[PDB]
Amino acid sequence: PKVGRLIYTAGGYFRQSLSYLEAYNPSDGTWLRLADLQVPRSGLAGCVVGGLLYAVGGRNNSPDGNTDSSALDCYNPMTNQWSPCAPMSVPRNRIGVGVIDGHIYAVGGSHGCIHHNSVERYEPERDEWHLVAPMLTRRIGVGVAVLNRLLYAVGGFDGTNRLNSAECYYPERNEWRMITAMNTIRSGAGVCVLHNCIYAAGGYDGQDQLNSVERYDVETETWTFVAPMKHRRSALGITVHQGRIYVLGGYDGHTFLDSVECYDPDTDTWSEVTRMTSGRSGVGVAVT
């Protein structure tokens, strides 16, 4: 039932880490600029819990220095204000995040040369982070999405090898299992869930930025390709609004895209949507 939810994009990178927060309304194609991030952020992830948007991890890279972030910050769309939250145990650039049972999971990402396999869990009611079981693989530039209270970490770079592998976190048991590997090596893909499938869109295969898109069907256990995007991209934002996937921005090996494409699983087609207000990669994105 269409009730006016918006796609939020926070931070990003375009000649330095950005502070933009903007919200897009797919039903009229308009963009609204909102309160800036307090500290510039790129390579962060976004998510929504209890009507609030959270900006997790990332980095501030500019001529004033390159520093990874352990920060968590919370934006209330109803007040248009950002508030700091307790930081993570470690900085995590190119993090993946998923929400289960009202808790935020921060997965992998990097701090300097360290590629984390560690995973930690944020409880909003306590403003507290708790380390959980680490992944089986170190993963930066990892994609994460949640389906039926299971969390999937897909692809990335482990510090030596760029990855086609993926693994599944069972939060009640606090354990990780490898799942079927993807058809393609992808770091910096957009990973989301739609219906019974975990999608991995675009990314970097170690040579080229990708326009291919493949999905893992959790029932059949296979990765299968679907229609490719029009524009190749890694470090894209991805989210699901009213039953369709949207990808936002990213880097195509030449430019930082303002392109937004929208995928309809019913027809297996991507359509072009109104451009971002400016090209950028490495954004955090969520819907509320």
Curated annotation (Swiss-Prot):
Annotated family: Belongs to the KEAP1 family.
Modified residues (S-cGMP-cysteine): 113
Free-text domain note: KEAP1 contains reactive cysteine residues that act as sensors for endogenously produced and exogenously encountered small molecules, which react with sulfhydryl groups and modify the cysteine sensors, leading to impair ability of the BCR(KEAP1) complex to ubiquitinate target proteins.
Assembly with partners or alone: Component of the BCR(KEAP1) E3 ubiquitin ligase complex, at least composed of 2 molecules of CUL3, 2 molecules of KEAP1, and RBX1. Interacts with NFE2L2/NRF2; the interaction is direct. Forms a ternary complex with NFE2L2/NRF2 and PGAM5. Interacts with (phosphorylated) SQSTM1/p62; the interaction is direct and inactivates the BCR(KEAP1) complex by sequestering it in inclusion bodies, promoting its degradation. Interacts with NFE2L1. Interacts with BPTF and PTMA. Interacts with MAP1LC3B. Interacts indirectly with ENC1. Interacts with SESN1 and SESN2. Interacts with HSP90AA1 and HSP90AB1. (Microbial infection) Interacts with ebolavirus protein VP24; this interaction activates transcription factor NFE2L2/NRF2 by blocking its interaction with KEAP1.
Tissue: Broadly expressed, with highest levels in skeletal muscle.
Effect of residue 13 to A: Loss of interaction with NFE2L2/NRF2. Strongly reduces repression of NFE2L2/NRF2-dependent gene expression. Loss of interaction with PGAM5
Site description Sensor for electrophilic agents, residues in chain: 113
Compartments, as annotated in UniProt: Cytoplasm; Nucleus
Changes after translation: Non-enzymatic covalent modifications of reactive cysteines by electrophile metabolites inactivate the BCR(KEAP1) complex. Accumulation of fumarate promotes the formation of cysteine S-succination (S-(2-succinyl)cysteine), leading to inactivate the BCR(KEAP1) complex and promote NFE2L2/NRF2 nuclear accumulation and activation. Nitric oxide-dependent 8-Nitro-cGMP formation promotes cysteine guanylation (S-cGMP-cysteine), leading to NFE2L2/NRF2 nuclear accumulation and activation.
Effect listed in the UniProt record for changing residue 115 to A: Loss of interaction with NFE2L2/NRF2. Abolishes repression of NFE2L2/NRF2-dependent gene expression. Does not affect interaction with SQSTM1/p62
Kelch repeats: 6-51, 52-102, 103-149, 150-196, 197-243, 244-288
Identification of the protein by name: Kelch-like ECH-associated protein 1
Organism: Homo sapiens
Effect of residue 162 to A: Loss of interaction with NFE2L2/NRF2. Abolishes repression of NFE2L2/NRF2-dependent gene expression. Loss of interaction with PGAM5. Does not affect interaction with SQSTM1/p62
Residue span relative to the full protein: 322 to 609 of 624
